[PDB]
């Protein structure tokens, strides 16, 4: 039957969820499963083995965090099943899995097997009435109130650029590169090892994520700023320690614009955006340059878009008006857009029937993938 549908954004690091017709995701919690790595002696301790949810951040000094989704592709399927059940848990949604149409998102160009296996989970473990899997870009266009644009996002693990012109998506112009937030944080962790801090545990890694979200900032000209010393921010650990970052506060998010630093022949995020535009036709290049829509949490770096303008302006043709729109709700654009598309009747004319899935299987979702 069709009750109020549920939108779930499988952000490779932060999963965002809520019902359709809403206006904000009230269920935002990081994506992992934390199991304890210590010994239990005192009866009356914490509860349960796995610790998905806010309890993880509340007791991170005990857990051994494991990420289920690496680069948008799920590795530990059992963890994603536990996380999805936690989304339907009594602390997050309280509904039953056999009650709502599910609007699952997905990073573009993910392997076929990922969609297939997600279908198996949602129609065998959960017995959902309906399911639809879509691109993350289209949703951001819904949440940004537009129809034409190039959604250049940066989730926690996959950055990509999808150029959509007047609601028509151009698949051959999609550029995907697997270097996002986790790689920025991982590279920053390596820099702190060279600064003498040796963060190597799992909880230490999420402390690095907190640093990346708070102390880093992007460059404008990394040589102008490389020849001069900087602020050297003093971040305080929860323990009470004191860490200094130095020039790595701007060298850490340089990995996005240049994967040569991490030792990887790939393209910058600017090259992804510019190529994604240029892989398309010629009559549309000017309009796509005039409508660049960001989303994704790894575009929230301070001083990011200004460097993006200097970069694309350095690459795009002469005097073309490059116009980047970056809203405040970039972190939830895919969720808000999922709510917008799921709050329609075309959505009823757009999902995949449970019966039809049982009759067909993988071929059903690969036909209705767009």
């Amino acid at each position: 039957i069709a009750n109020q549908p549920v939108v779930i954004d499988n952000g490779s690091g932060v999963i965002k969820a809520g019902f359709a017709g809403d206006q904000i995701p009230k269920y935002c919690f990081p994506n992992y499963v934390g199991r304890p790595k210590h010994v239990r002696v005192m009866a009356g301790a914490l509860e349960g083995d796995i610790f998905i949810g806010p309890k993880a951040e509340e007791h991170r000094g005990l857990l051994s965090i494991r990420y289920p989704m690496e680069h948008g592709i799920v590795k530990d399927w059992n963890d994603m099943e536990r996380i999805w059940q936690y989304v339907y848990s009594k602390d997050q949604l309280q509904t039953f899995s056999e009650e709502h149409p599910v609007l699952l998102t997905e990073a573009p160009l993910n392997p076929r097997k990922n969609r297939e296996r997600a279908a198996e989970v949602f129609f065998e473990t959960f017995n959902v009435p309906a399911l639809f899997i879509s691109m993350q870009a289209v949703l951001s266009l819904y949440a940004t109130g537009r129809t034409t644009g190039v959604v250049l996002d940066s989730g926690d693990g996959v950055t990509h650029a999808v150029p959509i012109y007047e609601g028509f998506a151009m698949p051959h112009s999609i550029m995907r590169i697997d270097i996002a937030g986790r790689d920025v944080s991982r590279f920053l962790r390596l820099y702190l090892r060279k600064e003498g801090y040796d963060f190597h545990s799992s909880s230490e890694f999420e402390i690095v994520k907190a640093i990346k979200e708070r102390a880093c900032y992007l460059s404008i000209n990394p040589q102008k700023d490389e020849t001069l010393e900087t602020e050297k921010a003093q971040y305080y650990l929860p323990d009470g320690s004191t860490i200094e970052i130095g020039p790595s506060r701007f060298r850490a998010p340089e990995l996005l614009f240049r994967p040569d630093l991490i030792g990887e022949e790939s393209e910058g995020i600017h090259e992804v955006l510019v190529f994604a535009i240029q892989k398309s036709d010629m009559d549309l290049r000017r309009t796509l340059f005039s409508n660049i829509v960001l989303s994704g949490g790894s575009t929230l770096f301070k001083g990011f878009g200004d460097r993006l303008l200097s970069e694309v302006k350095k690459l795009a043709p002469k005097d073309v008006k490059i116009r980047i729109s970056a809203p405040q709700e970039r972190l939830y654009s895919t969720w808000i857009g999922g709510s917008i598309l799921a709050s329609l009747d075309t959505f009823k004319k757009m999902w995949v029937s449970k019966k039809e899935y049982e009759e067909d299987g993988a071929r059903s979702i690969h036909r209705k993938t767009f």
Partner: peptide
């Protein structure tokens, strides 16, 4: 706005439109 406060991370005090100047 409260709707963009209640959430954990939001670009507070940042220009929303990045665009090249005039003088084409």
């Amino acid at each position: 706005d409260p709707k963009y406060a209640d959430l954990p991370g939001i670009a507070r005090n940042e220009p929303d439109v990045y665009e090249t100047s005039d003088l084409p």
